[PDB]
Amino acid sequence: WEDEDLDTDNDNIPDSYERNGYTIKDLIAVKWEDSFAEQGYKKYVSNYLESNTAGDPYTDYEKASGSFDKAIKTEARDPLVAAYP
């Protein structure tokens, strides 16, 4: 509905954030803004009806936060790129 208090897939990121754009800071998802780009933050988009957008064993929140094995390449931290050997 008309508020940012929905989590259909139940992956700790609101529906509209996954739909439009978001980034993780202090292990909490926040709305994306253009001023964040200069500080080195990336813009993430992902499926709001799926817990694992890329199908890999890690959820969207784990990939966006980088809370998985720290030996995985940094490009595999966005939900649209799969971690896969």
Partner 1 sequence: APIERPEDFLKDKEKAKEWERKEAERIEQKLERSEKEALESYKKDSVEISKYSQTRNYFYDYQIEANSREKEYKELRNAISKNKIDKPMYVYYFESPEKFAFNKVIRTENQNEISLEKFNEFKETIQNKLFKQDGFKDISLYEPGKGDEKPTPLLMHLKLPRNTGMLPYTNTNNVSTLIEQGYSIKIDKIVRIVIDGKHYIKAEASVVSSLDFKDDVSKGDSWGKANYNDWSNKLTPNELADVNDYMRGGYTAINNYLISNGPVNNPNPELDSKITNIENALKREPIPTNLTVYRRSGPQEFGLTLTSPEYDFNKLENIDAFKSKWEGQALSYPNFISTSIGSVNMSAFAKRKIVLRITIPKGSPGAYLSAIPGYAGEYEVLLNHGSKFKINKIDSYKDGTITKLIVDATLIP
Partner 2 sequence: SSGQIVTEGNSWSDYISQIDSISASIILDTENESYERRVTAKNLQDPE
Of 9, 4, 12, 16, nearest to 63 by C-alpha is: 12
Residue 82 binds partner 2 (CB under 8 A): yes
Of 25, 17, 21, 46, nearest to 34 by C-alpha is: 21
For residues 29 and 17, the answer to whether their CB atoms sit within 8 Å is: yes
Distance (Å) of CA 59 to CA 18, 40, 68: 13, 23, 10
Residue 69 binds partner 1 (CB under 8 A): no
On whether 9 is known to bind a ligand per the annotation, the reply is: yes
Residues 39-78 that bind a second copy (CB under 8 A): 49, 55, 70
Residues 14-43 that bind a second copy (CB under 8 A): 26-27
On whether 50 is known to bind a ligand per the annotation, the reply is: yes
What residues line the site for a second copy (CB under 8 A)?
A: 8, 26-27, 49, 55, 70
What residues line the site for partner 1 (CB under 8 A)?
A: 1-2, 5-10, 12-14, 27-29, 61, 65
